Design a protein around this ligand. Structure first.
Ligand SMILES: Cc1cc2nc3c(=O)[nH]c(=O)nc-3n(C[C@H](O)[C@H](O)[C@H](O)COP(=O)(O)OP(=O)(O)OC[C@H]3O[C@@H](n4cnc5c(N)ncnc54)[C@H](O)[C@@H]3O)c2cc1C
Ligand SMILES: CCCCCCCCCCCC(=O)OCC[C@H](C)[C@@H]1OC[C@H](C)[C@@H]1C
Length: 451
């Protein structure tokens, strides 16, 4: 009847919250001095700066249901005004990526033949049978070379900060592969799905807008921490678990000393590496599978500027293609996107450095990373002004990379867990990277847990 949750990030918090709110007592244990994991918002120099994640697309019911059952729905905030535009640095300058098919055809985002090739997606050849094809392979077949080389690579780097050649399209973009399976052409599927909904309320309708909370994403975690209370233990590192008449025994280190705990079922919300260490003495082959999940390191450089030292930049931000051979991945554009996250007309840039193709840059110190960010923002965006604020967050264990073979690996992980009753896994490593995905998967697990 009692459950233990290892890891105090969103995956773990949401699982623990959903279990309690359905009549199942849960205990959560977190290594750090604080809950949240990657998610964290800091109040510094008149700004609200984000540790990692900045926003979520307001299109997931599970994250709405979580916000409702936590009295947060009125604190959600439009990714406000300014540019709905986004930019890609390609061929010498920042270029607006168009939002509509007619605008795209007249755009200069790609050369004429390359634009016409995207329209030729209607004649996309069949997908390779029984092959877990790469995102880049998917791109060349559907979109043409230029579109995948500049546009698809941008979307990819914006979400996973990874290698477009290594990422599995089935694991990273499941709805695109499903679309492909059903209609071959994506344009065809869009035309047909548009016809389907056109041929016939009660609660509302989700906008899909880029959203956050009024005090940043910290609002969600502070609301989770408060909802769990004494069930959420901070500075409690689990460093062992074993069987015991069904059931499970956790070895926990809290206030410098050793402690033990017996529970009916265990839920592991820790990153792949930390979870593998725990699974090792239990099943070496399963631990190997979990340990095989690659992570791309990433560092975020925040650069704040005094009101009037530079103009407010247009749009949600810009991304830079790997082929441009640059040391930065892109920037937001946070003050523009969410005005309330900056006071007194100050302008905030949140630059992203590293990814799967440049993991070595994240090892450098904070002053070197700040220097890097300024040089690139000068060469690409034309920002010459001196920053009045500078804050750097490094994640050596960054974003999990859903590379080729990932989907069959998660299947092998699932099959191995069935031989170990009462043991469960969630987290960004497995079946979704974003906040929305973690929240959804967390709720689904908790529901299925009451069996
Ligand atoms: C730079 C960056 C930007 C991002 N931007 C976005 C974005 O804007 N939109 C979006 O949707 N997503 C974004 N994400 C992705 C998303 O934030 C993460 O994938 C997600 O928050 C991970 O949550 P998690 O709980 O699954 O893992 P984690 O947050 O890492 O939680 C795992 C926790 O377990 C703890 N732990 C480890 N070992 C033990 C132990 N043995 N005992 C107890 N506890 C342990 C760790 O301390 C950690 O806190 C971003 C990620 C990064 C890093
Ligand atoms: C789509 C919702 C996010 C899904 C899960 C991860 C998304 C968060 C990306 C992690 C950060 C990341 O590593 O990529 C950099 C993000 C860049 C800077 C921004 O992407 C949109 C803007 C144009 C700007 C260039």
């Amino acid at each position: 009847m009692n459950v233990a949750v290892v890891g105090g990030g969103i995956s773990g918090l949401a699982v623990a919250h959903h279990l309690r709110s359905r009549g199942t007592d849960a205990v959560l244990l977190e290594s750090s001095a604080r809950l949240g994991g990657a998610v964290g918002t800091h109040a510094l120099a008149g700004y609200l700066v984000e540790q990692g994640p900045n926003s979520f697309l307001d299109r997931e019911p599970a994250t709405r249901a979580l916000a409702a059952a936590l009295n947060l729905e009125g604190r959600i905030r439009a990714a406000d005004p300014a540019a709905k535009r986004r930019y890609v640095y390609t061929r010498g300058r920042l270029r607006s990526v168009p939002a509509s098919p007619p605008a795209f055809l007249a755009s200069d985002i790609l050369p004429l033949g390359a634009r016409l090739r995207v329209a030729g997606e209607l004649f996309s050849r069949r997908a390779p049978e029984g092959v877990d094809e790469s995102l880049a392979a998917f791109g060349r077949r559907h979109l043409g070379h230029r579109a995948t080389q500049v546009l698809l690579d941008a979307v990819q780097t914006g979400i996973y900060a990874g290698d477009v050649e290594q990422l599995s399209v089935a694991a990273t973009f499941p709805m695109l592969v499903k679309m492909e399976r059903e209609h071959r052409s994506l344009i065809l599927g869009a035309i047909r799905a548009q016809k389907a909904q056109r041929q016939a309320g009660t609660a509302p309708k989700l906008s899909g807008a880029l959203s956050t909370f009024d005090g940043g994403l910290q609002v969600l975690i502070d609301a989770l921490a408060a909802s769990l209370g004494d069930a959420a233990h901070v500075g409690a590192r689990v460093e062992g678990l074993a069987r015991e008449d069904g059931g499970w025994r956790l070895i926990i280190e809290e206030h410098g000393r050793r402690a033990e705990l017996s529970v009916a079922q265990v839920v592991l919300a820790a990153p792949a590496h930390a979870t593998a260490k725990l699974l090792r003495p239990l099943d070496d082959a399963l631990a190997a599978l979990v340990a095989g999940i690659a992570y791309a390191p990433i560092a975020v450089v925040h650069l704040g500027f005094d009101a009037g030292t530079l103009p407010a930049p247009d749009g949600f931000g810009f991304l830079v293609p790997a082929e441009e051979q640059r040391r930065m991945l892109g920037a937001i554009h946070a003050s523009t996107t969410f005005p309330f996250r900056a006071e007194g007309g100050r302008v905030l840039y949140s630059c992203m450095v590293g990814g799967a193709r440049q993991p070595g840059l994240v090892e450098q110190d904070e002053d070197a990373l700040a220097a890097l960010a300024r040089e690139e923002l000068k060469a690409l965006a034309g920002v010459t002004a001196r920053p009045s604020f500078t804050r750097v967050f490094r994640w050596p264990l960054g974003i999990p990379q859903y590379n080729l073979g990932h989907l069959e690996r998660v299947a092998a992980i699932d099959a191995a867990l069935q031989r170990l009753p009462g043991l469960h896994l969630i987290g960004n490593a497995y079946k979704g990277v974003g906040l929305n995905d973690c929240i959804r998967n967390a709720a689904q697990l908790a529901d299925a847990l009451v069996a």
